[PDB]
């Protein structure tokens, strides 16, 4: 299978990429650099995750060492939410390019579509612990977005967490300018997204996967979650075509059409997930694993389910 899929502003995208969520900061370094040695040329970050000094350093390292040409990197952030306003857009994306130590990202994405009240505080709460919005709407974000490709500081913008409603808000905008080249969503064998995936697919949006493998040391995983890696139903696929439960989960959503963004600090993970070029799940197996979906949701937040824009009200 091809390593990259075309976006809508023309670039190339390798649909598998390095997850950082997550990563300590004492250990992204060495595994950014073994990524880009045994093949990745595709990182996800964002901000919010408070690790992106690390991983620039591993990216500065590999570049200085010719290991790779900037040309070659595809490198991902996300605006947190308390930078929606207008004023504050083009320093968020600013010091994310200074922390990574590039002049460019490839793709910049809104986090999600909703806004918080600007502040230190990355999540502003009130006293009962609801988060406190910002005024400032999706669309003047977006224009916001659109001048960082005006200013050449990123190459392509996108979104990530927006239900189709508000994808469509996106696509419907007076004055569209640059049309949102990714929506970045969770998507696994329990919340496998037809609907999203499908509306994102034929506007031309390419949709990446995040938590391909459920996400198994989210903060909130509880003992009586379900478990991808360990489902026997799945592992029983990965054993009939000799490969993980992980290259399963991995090769899965590419197989969709979909970017896929598996992250791991452990070297031998890191190699492991990136084994998944050269075999393919039959159209039965892909049918098979979509069965399993569940609606089950892993990364959403309690504190913002009244904000206006929380996108998960919605069917999809
Ligand atoms: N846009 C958004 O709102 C959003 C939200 C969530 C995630 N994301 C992005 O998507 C990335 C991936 O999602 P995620 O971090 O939630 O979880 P994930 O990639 O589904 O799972 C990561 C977990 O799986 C483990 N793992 C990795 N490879 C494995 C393998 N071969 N065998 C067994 N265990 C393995 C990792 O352990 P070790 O690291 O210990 O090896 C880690 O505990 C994130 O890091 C982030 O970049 C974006
Ligand atoms: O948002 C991600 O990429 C991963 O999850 C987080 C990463 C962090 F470093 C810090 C927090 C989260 C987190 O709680 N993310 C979840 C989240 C964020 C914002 C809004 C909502 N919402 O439901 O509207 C949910």
Request: charged share 25%.
């Amino acid at each position: 299978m091809a390593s990259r899929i075309l976006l809508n502003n023309g670039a190339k995208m390798p649909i598998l990429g390095l997850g950082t969520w997550k990563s300590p900061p004492g250990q992204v370094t060495e595994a950014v650099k073994v990524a880009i040695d045994v093949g990745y040329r595709h990182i996800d970050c964002a901000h919010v995750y408070q690790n992106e000094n690390e991983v620039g350093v591993a990216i500065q390292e590999k570049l200085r060492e010719q290991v790779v040409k900037r040309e070659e990197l595809f490198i991902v952030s996300k605006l947190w939410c308390t930078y929606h306003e207008k004023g504050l857009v083009k320093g968020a994306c600013q010091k994310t390019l200074s922390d990574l130590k590039l002049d460019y990202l490839d793709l910049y994405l809104i986090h999600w579509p909703t806004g918080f009240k600007p502040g230190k505080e990355f999540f502003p709460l009130d006293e009962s612990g609801n988060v406190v919005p910002s005024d400032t709407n999706i669309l003047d974000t977006w224009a916001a977005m659109e001048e960082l490709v005006d200013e050449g500081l990123v190459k392509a913008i996108g979104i990530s967490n927006f239900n189709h409603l508000q994808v469509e808000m996106i696509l419907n905008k007076p004055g569209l300018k640059y049309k949102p080249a990714v929506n970045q969503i969770e998507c696994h064998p329990y919340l496998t997204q037809e609907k999203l995936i499908q509306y994102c697919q034929s506007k031309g949006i390419v949709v990446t996967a995040y938590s391909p493998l459920g996400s198994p040391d989210r903060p909130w995983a509880k003992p009586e979650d379900p478990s991808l890696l360990e489902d026997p139903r799945i592992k029983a696929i990965a054993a009939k075509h000799n490969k993980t439960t992980a290259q399963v989960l991995i090769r899965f959503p590419m197989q969709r059409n979909l970017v896929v963004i598996p992250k791991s600090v452990t070297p031998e993970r890191i190699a492991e997930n990136f084994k998944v070029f050269d075999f393919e799940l039959s159209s039965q197996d892909m049918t098979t694993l979509l069965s399993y979906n569940r609606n089950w949701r892993v990364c959403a937040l309690a504190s913002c389910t009244s904000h206006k824009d929380y996108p998960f009200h919605e069917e999809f």
